[PDB]
Structure 1
Amino acid sequence: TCLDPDASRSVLGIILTRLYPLTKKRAKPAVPLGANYRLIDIPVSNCLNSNISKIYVLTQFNSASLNRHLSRAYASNEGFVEVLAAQQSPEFQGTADAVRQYLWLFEEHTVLEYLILAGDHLYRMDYEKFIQAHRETDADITVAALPMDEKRATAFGLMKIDEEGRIIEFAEKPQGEQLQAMKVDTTILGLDDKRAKEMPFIASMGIYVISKDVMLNLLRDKFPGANDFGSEVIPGATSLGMRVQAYLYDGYWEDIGTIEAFYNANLGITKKPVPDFSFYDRSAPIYTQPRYLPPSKMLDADVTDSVIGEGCVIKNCKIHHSVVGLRSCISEGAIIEDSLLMGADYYETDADRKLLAAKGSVPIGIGKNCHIKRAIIDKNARIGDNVKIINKDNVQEAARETDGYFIKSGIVTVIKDALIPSGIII
């Protein structure tokens, strides 16, 4: 394991509506995660921990907030972390189109490979072993691959490789007879019969190492009309007989690109005796903006199976199987269950409270005697007293933006900065 030239100067990292309404009024890479983070911290941290310092973040539109976070957490710390926006304002586009739109600029860098990191996932990876496999196999394109169960199988592009890991057959989210014809022996990649039997597939993780020249050729010369890397470029590449290599990844990897997946993965960090995924790691930790928030205060909290973010201010309440984000105010008598509180971007001066109260408005936080269950409370929500978010009738889907929320997969998501009046029941 020893890249040469090191990744620092020869690899350009490129990070690329199912999360509605967390993306209603913010850039998607900025969506808060794990109490003290944002989605963008996963790929940016993995790069930095893998000695990759040249990072472009492709996104739909610029955001002062996103920039502030990137600037304060990384940019001010040879490298760079720059945002490239697709349009000039916030009023769809494929993975291949996103990269093609800026190819002209990526080509301006003197690098050997492009490390393409698409989609939103929870995982820690040392991209150096990825880049190394790519260079040792003289690959044109290398795809990180994960052992998949027949279950989730058709939701990912699947592949078959030779004893070298060279991809010989790629089949996008196949089904029926082809979903069966792709099934391969997952022992050759180390796994054992037991689980080689439960996960009989090699699935693309949607991240790739692609040789500089190969990229230009593929996106502009060979497949100028392709929109997706997964379903068009990769397949295209293989049919042209290019060297498409597979790199077996064997750690935790969760898609959090949908409300329910996001929800589940966030609450998974509360698991014992070890979280599913650990943001902290002595060697490769996930970073974020340093904030100097004070230690969390708890007046009288019975907390079970939960994690508490930075600088929370909690009264007498009950918190169960939840994630409480930074700067969360939880008032007297609240009960928090199986929920993700994203917290707040600032504190209200208390004096501020006794003022909003006079006006009959509600302050940031979970109001008194609230009952929040199976929910996502986005940043700065103002939940009035006696609000009950329980969705008794187990409604699966409901678009209620006007009332401050949106239900997806039965999970109620209160919108950023929304006010849920006192007494409301959802």
Structure 2
Amino acid sequence: VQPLARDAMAYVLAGGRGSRLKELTDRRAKPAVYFGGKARIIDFALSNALNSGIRRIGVATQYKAHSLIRHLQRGWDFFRPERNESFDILAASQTQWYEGTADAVYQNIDIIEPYAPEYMVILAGDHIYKMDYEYMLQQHVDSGADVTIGCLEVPRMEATGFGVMHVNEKDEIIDFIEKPADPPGIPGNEGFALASMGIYVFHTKFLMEALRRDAADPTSSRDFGKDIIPYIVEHGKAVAHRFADSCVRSDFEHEPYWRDVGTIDAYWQANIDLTDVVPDLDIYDKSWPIWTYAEITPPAKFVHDDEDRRGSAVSSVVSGDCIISGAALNRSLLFTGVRANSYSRLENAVVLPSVKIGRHAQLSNVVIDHGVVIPEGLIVGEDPELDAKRFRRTESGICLITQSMIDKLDL
């Protein structure tokens, strides 16, 4: 009768570095990366935990986690222990670092056991999705599984880049293959394979034993995906949970939404798609809200309207404390505090907070880093060979622009 989330603790793995995001994660961890206009990536997993009724959350951080920890301190500060709530920030140590994803839990057993939760919900903190974990908790205790694993249903070509669960008639996992050339199809549903989301449900006592076992192991790489889960799919019982079964779909979302934003192109695409008339992600959904750190800001402002300059945004998303002064914006996403100045133009641009666009500058197909000041008259998106020399340019043509790249510029 009692919802299982009451006795569950969410453990969010947020030590990911996000290498292929390049300079975008040079001084911040991937979960701390901005998304959607006002939030960070980590906020989705945490909001999923909150909205699912999970009252205890732990966040494990590792490398370049200053801005992530500061975000968590100021954004996720409303939990009170005397109301049986808890939000623990568990930075590395805890010697220096976590030797792995599983080690990130093992090192903090004495944080977990005082709470004595019945269930452990292990979550990847670097994905953008909405999901009700209550469904996954029910399945785990119903099935009697040692571990329940959240899985995406993806076409078999696409599953080649994922960790794939080999499933039987009863969605029981018989084998795990990382990056299969030919991914095992679902029994009776070939053409689709199950891709692991990096979401794991355990009974706490089982998980504590499995990580103590893993720690005393000289060969282990101390990871769930590589050491913990492969051991269980063999000796124990591992079952699969479908994302479609628990995904919280807005009535304005055509399919279960899940983004890894693992590359610059992917990050740019996921953000720009929010400027659609009908976007895949419905950020205006009130049923399953995403909490984050936000300050009271002034409203967006658009000025100038003459023969040579007009401050205006079309097909765009614009946040607070933005002043669009004689600047033309099209198909762009502007985070809080952007200053765009006269005669400048933005097209296909994802613009992170507190960026300044100088007069006469024209930028197309770009991701601009937090706080960057774009010099007056700079042009991006016109000369591919020039843009590649100056900035990080994808083969799709998206340029990532940071202040360090701008500093090296006089030509």
Fold equivalence (TM over 0.5):
yes
Alignment check: 8 A CA contact 2:167 2:187 kept: no
Per the alignment, residue 316 of structure 1 pairs with: 326
Per the alignment, residue 224 of structure 2 pairs with: 229
2:230 maps to amino acid? P
Q: Which moved more, 1:94-103 or 1:156-165?
A: 94-103
Alignment check: 8 A CA contact 1:384 1:419 kept: no
Identity %: 32
TM-score, structure 1 length as denominator? 0.81
Alignment check: 8 A CA contact 1:312 1:328 kept: yes
Unaligned runs of 5+ in 1: 188-195, 345-363
Alignment check: 8 A CA contact 2:101 2:222 kept: yes
Per the alignment, residue 355 of structure 1 pairs with: none
In structure 1, C-alpha distance between the alignment counterparts of 2:341 and 2:373, rounded to whole Å: 11
Per the alignment, residue 369 of structure 2 pairs with: 378
Per the alignment, residue 240 of structure 2 pairs with: 246
2:366 maps to amino acid? A
In structure 1, C-alpha distance between the alignment counterparts of 2:62 and 2:33, rounded to whole Å: 14
In structure 2, C-alpha distance between the alignment counterparts of 1:91 and 1:208, rounded to whole Å: 23
Relative to structure 1, is the Cα distance of residues 119 and 287 closer, same or farther in structure 2, using a 3 angstrom cutoff?
closer
**Is 1:147 aligned to 2:137, yes or no?**
no
Per the alignment, residue 213 of structure 1 pairs with: 205
Per the alignment, residue 411 of structure 1 pairs with: 398
Per the alignment, residue 23 of structure 2 pairs with: 21
TM-score, structure 2 length as denominator? 0.84
User: How big is the shift at 1:136?
Assistant: 1.3
Alignment check: 8 A CA contact 1:332 1:369 kept: yes
Relative to structure 1, is the Cα distance of residues 147 and 96 closer, same or farther in structure 2, using a 3 angstrom cutoff?
same
In structure 2, C-alpha distance between the alignment counterparts of 1:422 and 1:331, rounded to whole Å: 23
1:315 maps to amino acid? S
Aligned residue runs from structure 1 range 152-301, under 5 A? 152-175=158-181, 179=182, 182-185=184-187, 187=189, 197=191, 200-221=192-213, 224=217, 225-240=220-235, 242-250=236-244, 251-273=256-278, 275-299=279-303, 300-301=310-311
SS in 2 for 1:343: coil
In structure 2, C-alpha distance between the alignment counterparts of 1:343 and 1:106, rounded to whole Å: 36
SS in 2 for 1:338: strand
User: How big is the shift at 1:128?
Assistant: 1.0
Alignment check: 8 A CA contact 1:387 1:420 kept: no
Alignment check: 8 A CA contact 1:385 1:422 kept: no
In structure 2, C-alpha distance between the alignment counterparts of 1:219 and 1:101, rounded to whole Å: 9
Per the alignment, residue 99 of structure 1 pairs with: 105
SS in 2 for 1:18: helix
Aligned residue runs from structure 1 range 354-365, under 5 A? 365=356
User: How big is the shift at 1:280?
Assistant: 3.4
Alignment check: 8 A CA contact 1:119 1:257 kept: no
User: How big is the shift at 1:89?
Assistant: 12
User: How big is the shift at 1:285?
Assistant: 0.8
Relative to structure 1, is the Cα distance of residues 74 and 280 closer, same or farther in structure 2, using a 3 angstrom cutoff?
farther
Per the alignment, residue 119 of structure 2 pairs with: 113
User: How big is the shift at 1:63?
Assistant: 5.3
User: How big is the shift at 1:94?
Assistant: 3.5
User: How big is the shift at 1:105?
Assistant: 3.2
Alignment check: 8 A CA contact 2:349 2:367 kept: yes
Q: Which moved more, 1:251-260 or 1:40-49?
A: 251-260
User: How big is the shift at 1:336?
Assistant: 0.8
In structure 2, C-alpha distance between the alignment counterparts of 1:92 and 1:393, rounded to whole Å: 41
Alignment check: 8 A CA contact 1:139 1:243 kept: yes
SS in 2 for 1:69: helix
Unaligned runs of 5+ in 2: 245-255, 304-309
User: How big is the shift at 1:290?
Assistant: 3.2
Alignment check: 8 A CA contact 1:145 1:202 kept: yes
Relative to structure 1, is the Cα distance of residues 303 and 202 closer, same or farther in structure 2, using a 3 angstrom cutoff?
same
Alignment check: 8 A CA contact 1:60 1:90 kept: no
Q: For residues 248-278 of structure 1, what are the alpha-carbon distances to aligned partners after superposition, in whole Å with 9 as ceiling and x for unaligned? A: 01221111132222121111211222x1112
Q: For residues 182-224 of structure 1, what are the alpha-carbon distances to aligned partners after superposition, in whole Å with 9 as ceiling and x for unaligned? A: 123464xxxxxxxx64xx2111111111221222232221573
Per the alignment, residue 248 of structure 2 pairs with: none
Alignment check: 8 A CA contact 1:10 1:110 kept: no
